[PDB]
């Protein structure tokens, strides 16, 4: 337990949200590899299912503890463990839709388990758009810039996202995040990138709306010397 | 009781919110004149006070029932009473801050009272900005365009807002709203304007953070023949 | 000649531009009523015709001298005559397309003629969008907010525009303008609105791409006392 | 002459522009290494100097031929040579300022020289902002996403930029580009990244406003397998 963390951990999730007036609760459980930047999780809609919107919008809402950091970049996220960190993000879609999500990440060292409590709110998705019509097909892999705010001991993230559409199109979404360790650290990173790759597969049956999500994320510095 | 409404009504409010990680509950009570488009209300912070942010951001969150409508424009809001309407709005500040608010408006005919339940979420207000530093000084009066979405029996509102700053500056904020009557009406308006004027005065003491808010709003069509 | 202006004036136009790599020159001539806020003009494509894009995008580019001002609001535009004023505007379409236009307005008192020299640049219009496919059908009437910048003796304009589409849709465009009298005046207005209504009719033949444009514009203050 | 290109080339530049009403012409000459993604150039203000704005805004305006491409990603830019390619870009600053630039890139094989003709237009830079006050201090290195538009044989670029400020601040700017080879190729790349690093040093004297610019750029695919 480097920071209360081990090589392979279990994860528990609860999300409450509201999108275009529709309320929901999702729970989840998963397995992850903090130092590899890999996680796989299983989500289950527990109230308000079946959702009237693409599962895909919730993907980036379901933990930067799961990022592979080179030893030469300060790992702000693992350093915040076990107590953890919280994050706030706005999603600005190019069609005017707007989301906000807040999460709180925390470790139980005794259970070797990461807990994740989030709130997801979305307004203004066009009723006829690919989100509300569930015609999306995963996010394209990305490169997020992580920026230190040194007077405050917090980080900003900035990633321009593309949700691939079943019909061959792409829907742009701007992510702006604020990452806050529960204790503001004296050790801060310089700006760096984190690259991400998601997969998402619906596994819904007659009882429940269910799906499987994975992320692979790797932090790095500029490629220019 | 035209639509469960009388010339002068009382109003009750409850808001739960979260801004930059700070949770709060506000209650309120007021008096309003539906057909004059006038209302005055008194807000009281009931949890999480004193707020770390300008009271002003909550202003447009605290009821288009209070708008003076000419007889020649369909009044979508009064027509939705007594059951009422819900609305969803994103606030896009020019400094990257983002808010979402959801309200539900409903009439008790027996009490001659309008009830207002809202949720306010805000993320990314710069810690050193006039909002988090409480250096704001009311919104400038505005002209909002109301746009019918005829396939859906809902309205959009679009208003470009300016929060005046104590130091002589102005902070831009883009409001985009979706207004939904609980029953989608057959009678719909054409696009029109609603002009608004707010006043806000802090009345805080040692016991409580408290303030007084008023709105005057008037609907109209284009001035060009 | 109040400010070199008479009740009815003629107007001459020249525009050079470039949209998605396509260069053009348009000339025009018209008649206008400065104090009524009315103008009608005839445009003629002189190089690079037929244009590959909707005539409609050029509409707001083709003179705030033509606005009806109440005596109680300073008329910054007529006050700048005969020398005139220049203006700069960005057009931000919701599909990512971006335009810039610059105009210079000047009066010849001897000819009772207003001259208008402009530059129009547009990039990123999707090749398959209603602009490049010429499937637009005029702008919806608007309400622009005019804001004084008192340290500088210039004005800002802010109008949220809607280009109606032949198929029943609407394309949003954000106009942000800076208006600069060639001499910065001591007399400045308070913020006010200017409402606008355009008409546009193609009158193209075998020789030339030609069309007729009109504007009616009226300035006013807030409707709330 | 792989595509009319050699390992080390000279470059000639001409730019005409207009920023906040101020017109200028800049010329330049440089040396570059197409296959290394390196270039260094010397700019000289030939009309309208000294410029009233930061040299830094012109930096990304002064040739994706200078990018190091791995053999396994199609190099759209070198493949377009010697005839070349054109590009169009909007710059959206967070304070509302807006620029557009258009360039045309072409090779003279006989002279082993790349020619670069551009137009730069900027409107709405606040007179008191770090750009108009010349208080900027270079761009932070970036990661631009390059996206193929396969029906059209063109590319899009998307990069979120940060202009560092002399006072320790940062000013955000959104770059959106369209890259067009003069012949639309059958060979197209998949989406990839290009990382960039600029340096800029003023070398102005009594005769002329002059400066030295360098870029290093390297293309790559996602780091996730």
UniProtKB/Swiss-Prot annotation, chains A, B, C, D:
Pfam families for the chain: GFP (PF01353)
UniProt key word Acyltransferase: no
UniProtKB keywords: Chromophore, Luminescence, Photoprotein
InterPro entries on file: GFP, GFP-related
GO BP terms: bioluminescence
Modification(s) after translation: Contains a chromophore consisting of modified amino acid residues. The chromophore is formed by autocatalytic backbone condensation between Xaa-N and Gly-(N+2), and oxidation of Tyr-(N+1) to didehydrotyrosine. Maturation of the chromophore requires nothing other than molecular oxygen. The precise stereochemistry of the tyrosine has not been determined.
Stretches that traverse the bilayer: none
Tissues with expression: Tentacle and oral disk.
Practical application: Fluorescent proteins have become a useful and ubiquitous tool for making chimeric proteins, where they function as a fluorescent protein tag. Typically they tolerate N- and C-terminal fusion to a broad variety of proteins. They have been expressed in most known cell types and are used as a noninvasive fluorescent marker in living cells and organisms. They enable a wide range of applications where they have functioned as a cell lineage tracer, reporter of gene expression, or as a measure of protein-protein interactions.
SUPFAM superfamilies: GFP-like
Reported function: Pigment protein that is yellow-green in color.
Family: Belongs to the GFP family.
Name assigned to this protein: GFP-like fluorescent chromoprotein FP506
Species annotation: Zoanthus sp.
Source species taxonomy: Eukaryota, Metazoa, Cnidaria, Anthozoa, Hexacorallia
């Amino acid at each position: 337990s480097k920071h209360g963390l081990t090589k392979e951990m279990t994860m528990k999730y609860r999300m409450e949200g509201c999108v275009d007036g529709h309320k929901f609760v999702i729970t989840g459980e998963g397995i992850g590899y903090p130092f590899k930047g890999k996680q796989a999780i299983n989500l289950c809609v527990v109230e308000g299912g079946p959702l009237p919107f693409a599962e895909d919008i919730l993907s980036a809402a379901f933990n930067r503890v799961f990022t592979e950091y080179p030893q030469d970049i300060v790992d702000y996220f693992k350093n915040s463990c076990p107590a953890g960190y919280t994050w706030d993000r706005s999603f600005l879609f190019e069609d005017g839709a707007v989301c906000i999500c807040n999460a709180d990440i925390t470790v139980s060292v005794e259970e070797n388990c990461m807990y994740h409590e989030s709130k997801f709110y979305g307004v203004n998705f066009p009723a006829d758009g690919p989100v509300m019509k569930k015609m999306t097909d995963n996010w394209e892999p990305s490169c997020e810039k992580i920026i230190p705010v040194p007077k405050q001991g917090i980080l900003k993230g900035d990633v321009s996202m593309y949700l691939l559409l079943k019909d061959g199109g792409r829907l742009r979404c701007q992510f702006d995040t604020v990452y806050k360790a529960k204790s503001v650290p004296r050790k801060m990173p310089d700006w760096h990138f984190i690259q991400h790759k998601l997969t998402r597969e619906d596994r819904s049956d007659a009882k429940n709306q269910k799906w499987h999500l994975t992320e692979h994320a790797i932090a790095s510095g500029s490629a220019l010397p």
